[PDB]
Write a protein that binds this ligand. Structure first.
Ligand code: FAD
Ligand code: FAD
Ligand code: TE7
Ligand code: TE7
Ligand code: ZN
Ligand code: ZN
Lengths: 228, 228
């Protein structure tokens, strides 16, 4: 009985991202999984890390330090409820899928804000308690990314460099840091210029992969895997 | 008679980041440069890429495509005023300094939002204007980042990998792509754990570097620079 959270970052339900999110919901639901989706734009999710994220007395009201104050607020249970709502979803999930279009070799800012605000010290990691010792150990994560650039542009000898290069801050710096094991990324290249049949093939490839997702092992989330 | 824009992303004026920003203002002003600062948190800068970024009639009101709509709005002068205000500052600038604490191997979401929303097609890049040919060619950009991790953690074989690894999406995927020549990053490692004299040393290095910033040559912003 597996639980899945999909954190979804696209403005348009009819988009290629919307279709990938929906096929994931359909297929995981068909399998009998418990499925939850955080539709960040529809939630008008707050991306900014501010003192509003702490709802009670600050430990140093003279000089605001976001990391210190959110860590303390997590322990005291005085974080803003939008954050703790997301933490509950993550805590319960066996697998977290992130579905998003690549923006500037990274995640859209609304999703960056989810990472910044939800993955606070005490919840996602501690010092010590990170990388293999991260607090979300035992959980799986998977990035399902769409791009403007073609697969060929995203090779070692391409203009954009290899696709694994841009995965490093997300897979290693964020997910592995918090203790997740990382499943191989799903990258759907350049749907805007793909043919209708090619688009349909990309969506079907994702649905098909999800059929056996619970049999997969994570990647070795290392510099070598990313950079060779 | 050089013009500088500083895009600043910290919540707290008394922070190490705040001090680095003020030192830059003081020193560049002293030189007689024209200086502008976009204090993103103080501006409550909007990070989310949404249909509110277009003020005109949408080019396709049935299916919302952020990239297409903003490209068209740029050309028709119908982008939201917060975006066009930032574009004016960038257009006039000879150098753009980004001052920020590293969040998840990247920029804080509020600054990611500035990148997502300000650097639109038609303004910062186009077909064929990208990388060396990007539309902001002639301009210089510089990342001034502070970290939680020590320099030793940011080595090739260290836990975090080389600091150059996380710079790739920002320096190459973003700044170089838009035509910026990228000056060497200013990395102020672990100020929270540095001693008082080490902190003063890091600030002094920055102020001193700023004295001769106009004599610098851009880095070769290549995959080899970052990973080789
Ligand atoms: C701010 C910004 C920054 C960006 N930075 C980068 C970058 O650094 N690198 C990069 O490579 N790209 C970048 N891009 C491009 C971006 O990644 C792509 O535009 C995006 O991934 C396309 O996905 P989409 O869901 O929006 O496509 P869509 O435009 O929604 O989809 C394309 C087509 O697929 C169709 N479609 C939807 N569902 C189906 C279906 N089930 N079967 C058949 N077709 C279907 C749609 O109708 C549409 O015609 C950036 C874009 C923006 C706006
Ligand atoms: C959401 C989040 C994600 C993060 N992700 C990462 C990550 O992926 N990798 C990583 O390495 N770190 C990460 N960090 C840590 C973060 O990068 C550091 O905490 C930040 O860079 C510290 O900079 P600061 O300006 O906030 O330091 P501050 O705490 O504000 O300053 C440090 C000290 O220097 C002092 N100081 C200020 N001005 C001067 C001055 N003029 N001269 C002498 N001392 C001065 C201050 O008073 C303070 O005591 C993350 C933090 C958060 C909140
Ligand atoms: C790193 O390589 C990059 C960097 C930034 C990019 C893109 C690629 C990019 O491809 C892209 C885009 N593509 C689709 C164009 N037509 C097909 C709709 C649309 C908007 C937009 N805004 C920023 N970026 C955009
Ligand atoms: C990738 O390496 C990472 C990733 C995420 C990190 C950090 C490092 C990090 O150092 C850090 C942090 N440091 C100061 C805490 N102590 C030093 C007071 C505070 C908050 C916070 N939230 C996320 N992260 C934080
Ligand atoms: Zn890793
Ligand atoms: Zn480059």
């Amino acid at each position: 009985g597996k639980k899945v959270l999909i954190v979804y970052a696209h403005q348009e339900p009819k988009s290629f991202n919307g279709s990938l999110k929906n096929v994931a919901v359909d297929e995981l639901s068909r399998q009998g999984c418990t499925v939850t989706v955080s539709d960040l734009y529809a939630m008008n999710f707050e991306p900014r890390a501010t003192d509003k994220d702490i709802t009670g007395t600050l430990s140093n009201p003279e000089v605001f330090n976001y990391g210190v104050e959110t860590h303390e607020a997590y322990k005291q249970r005085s974080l803003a409820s939008d954050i703790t709502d997301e933490q509950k979803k993550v805590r319960e999930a066996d697998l977290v899928i992130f579905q998003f279009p690549l923006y500037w070799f990274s995640v859209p800012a609304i999703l960056k804000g989810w990472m910044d605000r939800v993955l606070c010290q005490g919840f996602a990691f501690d010092i010590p308690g990170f990388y293999d010792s991260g607090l979300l150990q035992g959980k799986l994560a998977l990035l399902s990314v769409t791009t403007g650039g073609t697969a060929e542009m995203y090779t070692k000898t391409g203009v954009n460099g290899d696709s694994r290069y841009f995965l490093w801050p997300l897979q290693h710096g964020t997910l592995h840091f918090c203790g997740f094991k990382v499943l191989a990324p799903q990258i759907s290249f350049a749907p805007e210029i793909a043919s209708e049949e090619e688009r349909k093939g990309m969506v079907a490839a994702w649905s098909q992969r999800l059929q056996t997702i619970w049999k997969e092992e994570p990647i070795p989330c290392t510099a070598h895997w990313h950079f060779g």
